[PDB]
Amino acid sequence: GRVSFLGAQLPPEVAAMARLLGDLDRSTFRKLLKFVVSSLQGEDCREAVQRLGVSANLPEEQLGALLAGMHTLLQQALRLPPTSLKPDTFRDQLQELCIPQDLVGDLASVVFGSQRPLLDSVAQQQGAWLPHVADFRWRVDVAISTSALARSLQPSVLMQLKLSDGSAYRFEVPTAKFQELRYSVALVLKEMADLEKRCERRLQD
Amino acid sequence: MLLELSEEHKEHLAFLPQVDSAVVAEFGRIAVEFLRRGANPKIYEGAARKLNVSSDTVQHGVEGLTYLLTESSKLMISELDFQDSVFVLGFSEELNKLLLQLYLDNRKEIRTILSELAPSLPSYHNLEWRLDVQLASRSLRQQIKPAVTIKLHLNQNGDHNTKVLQTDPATLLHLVQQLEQALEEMKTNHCRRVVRNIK
Amino acid sequence: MAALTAEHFAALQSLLKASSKDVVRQLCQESFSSSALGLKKLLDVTCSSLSVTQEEAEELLQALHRLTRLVAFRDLSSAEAILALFPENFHQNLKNLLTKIILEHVSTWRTEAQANQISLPRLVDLDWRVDIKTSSDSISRMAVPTCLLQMKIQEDPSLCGDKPSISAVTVELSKETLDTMLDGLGRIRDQLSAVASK
Amino acid sequence: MRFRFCGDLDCPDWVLAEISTLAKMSSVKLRLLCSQVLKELLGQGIDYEKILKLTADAKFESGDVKATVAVLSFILSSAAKHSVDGESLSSELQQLGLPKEHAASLCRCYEEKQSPLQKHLRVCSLRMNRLAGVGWRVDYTLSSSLLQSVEEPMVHLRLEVAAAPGTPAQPVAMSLSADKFQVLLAELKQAQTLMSSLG
Amino acid sequence: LDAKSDVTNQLVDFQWKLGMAVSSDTCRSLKYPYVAVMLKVADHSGQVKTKCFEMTIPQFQNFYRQFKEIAAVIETV
Amino acid sequence: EGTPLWRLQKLPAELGPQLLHKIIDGICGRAYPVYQDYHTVWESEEWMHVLEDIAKFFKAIVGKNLPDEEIFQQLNQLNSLHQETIMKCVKSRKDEIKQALSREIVAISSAQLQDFDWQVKLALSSDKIAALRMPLLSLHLDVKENGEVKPYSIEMSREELQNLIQSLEAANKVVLQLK
Amino acid sequence: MELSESVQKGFQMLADPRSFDSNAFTLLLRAAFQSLLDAQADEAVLDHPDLKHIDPVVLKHCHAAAATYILEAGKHRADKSTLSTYLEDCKFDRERIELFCTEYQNNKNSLEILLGSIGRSLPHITDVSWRLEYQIKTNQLHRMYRPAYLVTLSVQNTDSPSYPEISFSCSMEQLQDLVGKLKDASKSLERATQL
Amino acid sequence: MGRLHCTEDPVPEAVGGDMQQLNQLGAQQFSALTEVLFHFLTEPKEVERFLAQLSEFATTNQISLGSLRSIVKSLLLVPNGALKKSLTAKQVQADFITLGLSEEKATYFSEKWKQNAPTLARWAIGQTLMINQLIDMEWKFGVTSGSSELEKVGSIFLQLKLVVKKGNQTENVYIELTLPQFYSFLHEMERVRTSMECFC
Amino acid sequence: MAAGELEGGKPLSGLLNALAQDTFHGYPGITEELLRSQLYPEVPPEEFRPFLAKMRGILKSIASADMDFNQLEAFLTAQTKKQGGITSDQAAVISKFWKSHKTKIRESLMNQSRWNSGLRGLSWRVDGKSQSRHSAQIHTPVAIIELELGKYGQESEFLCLEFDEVKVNQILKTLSEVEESISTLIS
Amino acid sequence: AALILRESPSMKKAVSLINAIDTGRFPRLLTRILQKLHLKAESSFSEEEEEKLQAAFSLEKQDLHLVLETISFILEQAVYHNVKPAALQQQLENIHLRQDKAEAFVNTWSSMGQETVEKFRQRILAPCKLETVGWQLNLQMAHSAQAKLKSPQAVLQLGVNNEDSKSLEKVLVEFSHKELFDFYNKLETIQAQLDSLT
């Protein structure tokens, strides 16, 4: 079924935008749209917003209202997959927001053009929260002899780890604990495979 | 799923069928206490010497019984799965009933113990706040600058920790709106589908 | 172990765009050698040398990293060992050039992998001075030997942070302590001699 | 619509529910529980065996005594925070549906403790550390390698900085020249003279 | 020449101050005379560093006497 | 043999006053001279050596506060143009060097306050009470220790500020006896 | 407004047509304002011939006096009445008083922006991010089947521009409690306006 | 008093009075006091033991603790100076006779000094300055079989742990050497040894 | 009220000593309940406490003030003549206490006034150099030095140093400049 | 045979004391010592156990310390040479241990020597070592910038000890299945190297 892309009600920011843009110069709107899309891509723009504002004779509060409402609207539209937010539902819901059709078409050019898969590839980057492995390395040795023991021949594995936050660690582990680690990893991999194959089917039912 | 015993765990339990059922029940009570208080080998010594048995055998027996109670509380197998487990262990219906009673009366408490072995993630404890207005400063002696002062309380590993923070009102309204949207996303249909079907 | 792919081979075929074989040598040694910090520079070197895009440079450097690390890891140091990796459609005029290049560098790559492998803090220099204590705050006259020993020790910046922070340690040994330590050290000699005699 | 004791909001669903658990106690036992909760808000604590023996004959579970202590401490904090009076408390409680004698039993407790409790809540408001004390030494310098005669005073200051009453303070210890000391004194006197106009 | 001295620390400079405490919040007449010394030091770790300490006149005089003993010994040895 | 100014003798006297003044400003903690203005006169090693030697000389001369006859005798090595240049550079501003030296004497201690700021707030309300209406001060201190500056912050009620003011006044009633 | 003798003596000389013509005085004010607000300011600010004909000691002393008075007037939010009163006490004429007060008014807001930039403040929250997950199984417990939230606040160190994150986890009850106390903290502003 | 070897400074007359008190105390009392003093000299850090044994002496002899500590210090003066100057027993006995200890009792204390001075001297030398003194060392040989870069490896190495004294603190230093660096380390340590044997 | 009856010389001297030990020497084992149960076991806490506190306040007022015996006699005259004052016997014992304990307290106040790190001690040896990897002989001795330092109530810092004969001479000259300053100022 | 055990006056004193003590209780205490021998951080007995040991032996404190130290040194040499019981018996006979104590010694050695040898064999010298492993498995459902997610995530914890800090650490990591498969392939290559070492 259809879903309201804004959620259960319009936030006051997007209402304030919609009441402001009703006669804005499309060139300035296109510039603001480029800025918003660039800032969603990770860039920064305070000097370009400023020189546009002074060029457009736009007050700081009007630029702020415009930018905030367009960012909220496009962020909410990206949150849904584009198959669910089918373009008829998008255009109709923006028409209920009373956006002028030229600006509806301009927003659709953001939500459905080649910028879409790039933004999707950026949105996935929020999902970590806990750092992933950066790299892993090892050395495996035989002691042969030791201060306590004329001979030993026990193996040991030295291991070293770095994490995507810049943390790094080095530790050595005996063979029994290495076998426990290897078993635990294989177990969790099996459980993850089974869980994925269950969910992927049961959510079709 | 069935809690199929290892051959070592079979050999461990195979001691108890020789013990008097009242003493198997006593070993059950001791084991299900040891699940929470921790073990005490003087009990193994005393019970074995009363049985005229070697203390290692009683130790192996009691700890096998503790492992049975742990794994059954981890899995939360059904009554009939536990019955099938003790039947394939080959215990008599006296001991099957005893073990089932020991299980069903305590598996919840064991789980309230075993949950502590999950890895420690930092988590929220409390929030404190203060609305205050800056009115002067050494360089500029009349002004009006409102802010919401905040103190955040957290814990990790059972510790206590705090953070001191500040926000403006517009940001605070944005925080409220976003965290309200976090709660709305548990009422939407997809998450309710997961929560029901992936049970 | 990590291995080549069809897209790595397609990227490798970009390497014939080199203006001179010295570019091939450089990009091989760098992509074997480079850290993730070095790749940022090596990408621009590859683009400047081959006119490739940054993405094509990234795919080429990834392919060369995978290839050279695989070769070092298995010790594929012979023509009969290396030449079978490349697919039957690969550029044979690249096949021979890259083979002979690899077979020349692999000895260096093999040699330096024994340094790049991980270690505890490594000794890099040592110094010592022996002196006689003659007087003190407590005994007006004395005469006994002492050794001052010094070591300079490196740590891995991977753990040490921005710098390997080469740092110094000194130790003082009395004669009984030195004789005990050598009644250690010599045991290593004797046991190694026994193992060689075994 | 709205409840004044909830700060012009609607009452939380858990409060409107758990006040019915309060309604299941007797009025005198509710009075005693309210008094013990007021002691808890005044920081005297509470004890599980007390609230049990006050309630276990009414078949209260541990969860029920815990929840009734929670709801009482909530409602009496909210009452004191908005400084709303016992007659208004009794009215909003009757609108929630607490029995007449139970509401009067709460009001007879709250009407005594409200002023002490509001004072305590004013003291217990959030603070960005506190100045526990000050120490100083004044010295005079005669000569140095850098100036064979100096003839100048110097001051040492220590601030004992703490988080909360009874927390161990840490000494911020520093040395000042007599000029910076006198400038600091004058600036602090200005800030005090300003602040005394605002209070 | 080689850094045979590097096995031990070296004093870069010696600076001194003579003064008197006069009072504290605990005592109106804390007439304690003292010498304060600042030592600036460089070391095998790199970066020049400094230490400060304060000692009473009898302790200073004992320190000075001990350096006189060190001088007398290194002259005698 | 000669005093550390022996290195100065080569400088053209028409360039001396600017160099010596800007180095004295460096002693006062102001900007030191830029090397570019003098790289034709000294190599960078000799440049840092003059930056040490001149400061050491001026500090030594003013620290013993010697009379100008003893200064002049202590300048028998200098050329007459440099003698007069250095003599005017001392007598014209020795007091800035003396204030810098007494500031360095205060640095013979374990920690020092570099600078401070103060701010006054009104707290309107809290999660504890809706009418807190409490005046507050924050004092911010920047204290040098171990070769770095630490930020500190001390909030105060009116009562805490009064106790601090009274104890500072008690200290000032002593400082006024000595200064 | 309490001021040092050096300041009032400087203004008592700035008062006098013989020390400075009223145009020279106005140019010296312009020089003072530039010497405060421009980071590239330098002694070249005194190079104008209406300035260079004054004794350099008097010129530099009165420049510093003017700049100090401008700073104090900004700090205490001086106005045309108090300015005119002080200038009358300094025996300025009406035209030089008006020329001062008009040039102060012309520069006042840049000086307001300058002065309010001073001093530290607490780390300021900039954004929030959240993730929602279902906990299913763990090292010992295979039946967890419960929701949890993973939350992050982005913040700036306002004292030293740098951007740490604070991250924590919430069960749904903890998230509802956090939301409820942030809502109360927001309604605080409405209740304070209507208090 | 006459000139003393144990002290260059004059000595209070209370020390002379205490020495006459050593003549007043009985032979068993003087012997027990001497044992208490040598116990304090050899193990002064066992302050609780010293206090216990001197309180026992006090209650045994009805001697007040102030007088006991006085006569202790007055008699420890000579052993203390003898340890400072490394005096002979003859000089110690002459100083005792000069302070006022009767010749027989000074001879007894001289013999108790003779039988203790070497271990006391060794203990006192143990109190002098040592910098980063080695407490202990551990070592482990080994052959490396593999790494993330090489499936098979021939490198051979030595690891050492050195334990180091840093005032009241201690430290562990971990280091790894190649085989040629082990050979050069042992060669340099033999060059140290022969240089140490030149003078030990 | 018992405050007028706690006059017993032995227990009162014990109490006064223990209060001085607690307040100034920092003895941790001394407490109100211990003092009461040893020295005045029948006096109830509500009547021992006010006198205990007031006499501690008197002792602090004396100890903090460097009272000479005339100022002390005046203060004790006030504390006896005022209503609820101490007795003449309490003043007499306070006088004899100050007359027998002044210097130890004042010394403890001086010792307590720590601010700068203290010199806890100095240790040194002089070694004659010999064989080294640098040269088969080395022709000079050196002093090896270490100061021990630290703030009050903290673990000791240690600072070790090496000086040659030239450094030793320079340090001796520097210290002689300090001694000559001190002697000039005290002369 | 080569010398196994040092002969000296301190050992002669200690064995003279050992011969004076009974043979009955001695092997139990030596077994507890032997059980503790591989532990550096604690004494083999509590202060009250050491007190009751001294009361049973009646020895003065330093004589008991000489006894316990020399039996510790005896067991360290027995470990180091992995001594055969009969060889230890002959060695103790050359020390002039009483024959019944030599029997009690070699019976004690037979009771625990291989176990203590193995406890020495597994000791790790590195300044840090791994202790424990645990894991958590979740399904991701939505986040602040995407919804209708189905991604499983596994958090991994590695429990570790630092012997320089003498404290725990708990490293935390995430894997998106892809990294967990890669990490497993690396761990299986480590296993292949540990097998090929055999």
Numbering used by the authors:
A (entry chain E): 20 to 224
B (entry chain B), D (entry chain D): 1 to 199
C (entry chain I): 1 to 198
E (entry chain F): 9 to 85
F (entry chain H): 5 to 183
G (entry chain C): 1 to 195
H (entry chain G): 1 to 200
I (entry chain A): 1 to 187
Q: Can I see the authors' text?
A:
The Commander complex is required for endosomal recycling of diverse transmembrane cargos and is mutated in Ritscher-Schinzel syndrome. It comprises two sub-assemblies: Retriever composed of VPS35L, VPS26C, and VPS29; and the CCC complex which contains twelve subunits: COMMD1-COMMD10 and the coiled-coil domain-containing (CCDC) proteins CCDC22 and CCDC93. The COMMD proteins form a distinctive hetero-decameric ring stabilized by extensive interactions with CCDC22 and CCDC93. These adopt a coiled-coil structure that connects the CCC and Retriever assemblies and recruits a 16th subunit, DENND10, to form the complete Commander complex.
